[PDB]
């Protein structure tokens, strides 16, 4: 029993993290096979971030003119290029600790952990989500860039962000491994805004039934809805419109627990229109949008 | 910028981490040098556990009565002993992957991360403090037993927790790796009530800290307090005295923002008093009490 926001062991990314230095900038690469990934603004001055030409930056650059090394072993890069806003940078050694592993583009709303690191060294593991407007709430210094984003299923590492940039607003943008950035962020120090943070109901509703699984039950009501009600009442509260998939996707929550999901909503539904009352639901004061329903699951269960 | 609850990296301790079964009941054994270190009622039946003798049970076993593997890898027990609630078994190989560690006995207040293992597989990492009232507050399943609380100090793991048991309302007892029950707990199926949980105020300030360092400023007030006065506020709200100790952790933190503690206190008053109104503190509706000083100062400053 008990519910926690839990990280994915970090071992199989530890073992991955090196440091990418570039002139004068220090940052983070992912080293798998015998390819190191990182940011490409590790090859930007400061005064370069405003309004850089990648391309034309990066004909002034020169394989040792890369310095990449893994614990106090410098790797040899035979070679880089380009892919999008990432470089690959070839050594001449395959990481000896690489971990089965994919890239994966995820979708707002998915969860994952994060090893926040500073000179390729790891300082912290948390659990993020991907946001409805593709920033990530973080927790990143200067020298954290080229830090990654990963899901563990058994023995794979699926890779899914790489951190890249701090808005004005102190949330935070960044890629896949193929160096695509999550929303419209671009690798440029300028105005760039975040659209709505709105809340995701699906994984609220997920927590919801982490909660009665947990002997949190104050909030159960004796009301029912429809998915087009529950979606006006949404709407007003900016939450992301709940659809049959989602409700498929809490099948399972539904059938552990005998709660059917659109009760459920009519128990988000009174939360929303009726506030906590300062009662707390898993130790939390609102309501917690970071806990897929398959996140749910996988802790309620023991998965490894 | 963004604050977050950070665990430790974990891999240091994956590496540690392996499969213990005595007759039926499996759990989880911590693998340092040639000891594994397991909780002692590996040894008992659950009929065992309403009243168990546990130097009677243990005469009845022997060094391969003890199953422990690494993997899928058995290990070979040459011996076992009980140092109070914990059992070690000499196996005939060091663990290769065994860091620099100590065991340290925590204080009340203090943080730490659980790998949450089954089976000897890590399923996943948070952060805890030991309550005042000596529970933490985990995420623990059956089979989860012998998974590990730890700091890293750089290079070093300081393990601090074993997860022996679940209260009948959910919070989690264990012990420290010399097998001591923190608190009054037992590993007996028993009546067996936690006392008050109250909050630990000295970290709720250094997260008030941590707050301002991050730009969530609303709570700032023009007042100002004394620890006396402070202290019958906390009183009545069920938070542990702030101490001039307390005062003197938070000192850089104090020096950092330019806010005195006193300052900060009368700050936490006010929320005390006042509540929150529907506004949030790095994305919490309550006081959040497991961020120490150090922790914030870490985090603030990308320790690895
Ligand atoms: C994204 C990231 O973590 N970066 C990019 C900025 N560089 S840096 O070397 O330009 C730098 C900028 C500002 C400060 C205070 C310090 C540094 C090292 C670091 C890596
Ligand atoms: C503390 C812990 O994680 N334990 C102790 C209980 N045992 S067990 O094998 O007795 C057991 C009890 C209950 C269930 C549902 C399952 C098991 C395996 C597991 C380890």
Same mark, same amino acid.
């Given at each position: ?25 220090? @940052? ?36 040792? %003119?890369? *310095? ?39 979708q707002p709303g998915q969860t994952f952990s994060v090893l926040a690191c500073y000179n390729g060294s790891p300082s912290g593991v948390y659990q993020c989500a ?20 990963? %899901? ?75 998915? %087009?009600?529950?979606? @006006? ?34 128990? *988000? ?16 004061? @609102? ?18």
């Open positions: 029993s008990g519910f926690r926001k839990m990280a994915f062991p970090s071992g199989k990314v530890e073992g991955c993290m090196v440091q990418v230095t570039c002139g004068t900038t220090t @940052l983070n690469g992912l080293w798998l096979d015998d390819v190191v990934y990182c940011p490409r603004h590790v090859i930007c001055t400061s005064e370069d971030m405003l309004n850089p030409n990648y391309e034309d930056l990066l004909i002034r650059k020169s394989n040792h %003119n890369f *310095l990449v090394q893994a614990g106090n072993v410098q790797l040899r890069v035979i070679g880089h290029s380009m892919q999008n806003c990432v470089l690959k940078l070839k050594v001449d050694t395959a990481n000896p600790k690489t971990p089965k592993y994919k890239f994966v583009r995820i991907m946001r409805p407007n593709f920033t990530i709430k973080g927790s990143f210094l200067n020298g954290s860039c080229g830090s990654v984003g990963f %899901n563990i299923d058994y023995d794979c590492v699926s890779f899914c962000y790489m951190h890249h940039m701090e808005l004005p607003t102190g949330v935070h943008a960044g890629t896949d491994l193929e160096g695509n950035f999550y929303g419209p962020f671009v690798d440029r120090q300028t105005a760039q805004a975040a659209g709505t943070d709105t809340t995701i109901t699906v994984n609220v509703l997920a927590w919801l039934y982490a909660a009665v699984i947990n002997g949190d039950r104050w909030f159960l009501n004796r009301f029912t809805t429809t998915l %087009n009600d529950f979606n @006006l009442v949404a709407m007003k509260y900016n939450y992301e419109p709940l659809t049959q998939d989602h409700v498929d996707i809490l099948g399972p929550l539904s059938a552990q627990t005998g709660i059917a999901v659109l009760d459920m909503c009519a128990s *988000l539904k009174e939360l929303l229109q009726n506030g906590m009352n300062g009662r707390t639901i898993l130790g939390s004061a @609102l309501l917690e949008d970071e806990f897929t329903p398959f996140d749910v699951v996988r802790q309620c269960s023991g998965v490894t």
